Structures are given as structure tokens and as C-alpha cells.
Amino acid sequence: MEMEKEFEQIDKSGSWAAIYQDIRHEASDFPSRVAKLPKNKNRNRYRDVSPFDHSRIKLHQEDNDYINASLIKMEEAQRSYILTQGPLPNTVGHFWEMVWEQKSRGVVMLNRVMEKGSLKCAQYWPQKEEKEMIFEDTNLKLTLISEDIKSYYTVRQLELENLTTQETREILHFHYTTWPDFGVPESPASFLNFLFKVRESGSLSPEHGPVVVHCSAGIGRSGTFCLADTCLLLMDKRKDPSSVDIKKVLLEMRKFRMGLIQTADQLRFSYLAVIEGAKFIMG
Numbered sequence: 204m205e206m207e208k209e210f211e212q213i214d215k216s217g218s219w220a221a222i223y224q225d226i227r228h229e230a231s232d233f234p235s236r237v238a239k240l241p242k243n244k245n246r247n248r249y250r251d252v253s254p255f256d257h258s259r260i261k262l263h264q265e266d267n268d269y270i271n272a273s274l275i276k277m278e279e280a281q282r283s284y285i286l287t288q289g290p291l292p293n294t295v296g297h298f299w300e301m302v303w304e305q306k307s308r309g310v311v312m313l314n315r316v317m318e319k320g321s322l323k324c325a326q327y328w329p330q331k332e333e334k335e336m337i338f339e340d341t342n343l344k345l346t347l348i349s350e351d352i353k354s355y356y357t358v359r360q361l362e363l364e365n366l367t368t369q370e371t372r373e374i375l376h377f378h379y380t381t382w383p384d385f386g387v388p389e390s391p392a393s394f395l396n397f398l399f400k401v402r403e404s405g406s407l408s409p410e411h412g413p414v415v416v417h418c419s420a421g422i423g424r425s426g427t428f429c430l431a432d433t434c435l436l437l438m439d440k441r442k443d444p445s446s447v448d449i450k451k452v453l454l455e456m457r458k459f460r461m462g463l464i465q466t467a468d469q470l471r472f473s474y475l476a477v478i479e480g481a482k483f484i485m486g
């Protein structure tokens with residue numbers, strides 16, 4: 204079926220939970236043996252969210268190459284994304300090592316450091332120009348260059364230096380700051396505006412390594428971001444845009460990381476975002 208009318212048909216019939224459970228039943232199951240090794244316990248935020256072995260990002264290190272991060276490679280859309288958990292106190296150096304080694308231009312953050320009164324990720328970037336951060340375990344230096352605070356999101360320019368070679372690179376930090384503590388946003392308009400700002404920066408384009416996208420677990424909000432982006436790109440590429448099937452795209456993405464889209468409300472919000480986004484694109 205088309206999307207917008209499949210949408211109204213699920214709303215009127217109140218069957219979002221059943222649609223979402225079908226997706227959960229049909230989703231791929233692949234091994235995640237490296238994630239579960241005892242030496243990696245303090246590298247995982249949640250025991251039930253792990254990268255598959257076949258698609259995990261490897262650190263360029265001989266001691267321990269493990270990080271909780273996955274490469275989502277979308278072949279028809281010609282887009283790639285790295286989806287990862289919010290960094291832990293003992294993995295902030297690994298996180299920036301990955302950004303460096305994979306040649307990413309941008310980092311997309313969809314959570315606040317504290318939500319619901321608990322810590323959802325480490326404070327992994329510097330908050331003041333004159334107070335830079337040094338990660339001694341991976342030999343990197345990180346400096347805040349500029350910050351632009353808007354009503355729904357903040358954009359930061361950061362300098363990452365490999366202290367071993369003295370090479371430097373400019374990294375863009377795109378921080379969506381207004382996702383509610385409970386539920387999903389009422390309108391997709393500010394999320395779409397944010398997606399378009401990431402696109403306009405070049406951070407999603409083939410002349411760079413894959414964008415790094417995270418929330419707390421790196422599957423819910425993060426899944427919503429890449430699902431909406433890929434669906435909108437396919438609608439621009441195909442002769443028949445009504446052929447884009449959001450449930451099929453989501454199952455393709457779940458071949459590369461488990462659990463993408465965590466609730467039926469997140470699934471409905473993804474539909475809404477793609478539907479509204481397709482109208483603004485045209486033309």
C-alpha cells in the first residue's frame with residue numbers, strides 16, 4: 204500500500220502495536236559473540252543491545268578492537284551510517300578513535316546528557332574554548348572552536364587532533380536537544396528541519412566517511428533518524444515514489460543492527476516524518 208493512506212488505515216483501526224510486533228518477529232537474528240566476551244562488559248551500556256559480529260566497527264588496535272557500534276550500509280539509497288551507543292566514562296577515547304579512523308565529518312546526538320534524572324551518556328566534548336580535552340588512552344586532543352545554540356538544536360565546530368601524527372580535522376557536532384523525556388514529538392517539523400541541516404553540511408555525503416549517529420542505546424531515536432533519511436532519498440531516486448515501503452526499509456536496516464525503532468510510537472512518528480518530509484521536498 205502507499206504510505207499516507209496505510210497510515211490513516213492503521214490509525215483508524217488502532218493496530219500500531221500489531222504492526223510493530225510483526226516487524227519484531229520478522230527481524231534478523233545474527234551472532235554478537237565479540238560483544239559478549241567478559242573483557243568487554245564495561246564497554247556496553249545495556250546488556251540487551253549489542254552489535255552483530257558481521258557489521259560491527261573494529262577499532263584499529265591489536266589489544267582490544269571492540270566498540271558498541273554498527274555500520275548500516277544502504278545499497279540502493281547509496282548512504283552509510285554508523286549507529287552507536289552514547290559513550291561511557293571508559294569508552295570516550297574509543298569513540299573519538301572511531302570518528303578519526305572512519306573519516307567521519309559529522310556526529311549526530313539525539314539525547315541530553317541527563318534525562319529522567321539519570322545519566323544517559325558521558326560529557327564527551329568540551330564546553331569551553333579554553334578547556335580542551337585530551338584522551339590519553341587513544342592519543343587524541345579535542346577542542347571546541349565555536350557553538351551556535353538554536354531553539355531546537357545546537358551545532359558545534361570541533362577540532363580533532365591525532366597527537367601521534369599532528370594531523371588535524373574539523374568535526375561538526377549536530378545536537379538535537381528537545382526530544383521529550385517520554386514519548387515522541389507531537390509534530391515532526393523540528394526533527395525534519397534538523398535532518399535537513401545535517402544534510403546541508405555535507406556530513407551525509409560520499410566524499411566523507413559515514414556519519415556517526417547516537418542516542419543512549421543507539422537504536423531508538425537513532426533508528427528514526429536514519430530510517431527517515433533513507434526513505435526520503437529513495438522517494439527522490441525512484442520513478443514511482445509511492446513504491447517506497449517503510450516497513451521493508453526498516454527490516455533491511457535491522458540486518459545490520461538489532462532493535463532499530465524501540466516502540467510503536469517511534470514507528471508511527473517515523474511514518475509521520477517521511478509523509479510530511481515528502482511534501483516539503485517538492486518541489
Ligand SMILES: O=C1CN2C[C@H](N1)c1ccccc1S2(=O)=O
Nearest residue numbers: 244245246247248249291292293
Ligand atoms: O553504569 C554503567 C557504567 N558502566 C557502563 C555500564 N553501565 C556497565 C554495565 C555493566 C558493568 C559495568 C558497567 S561500567 O563500565 O561500570
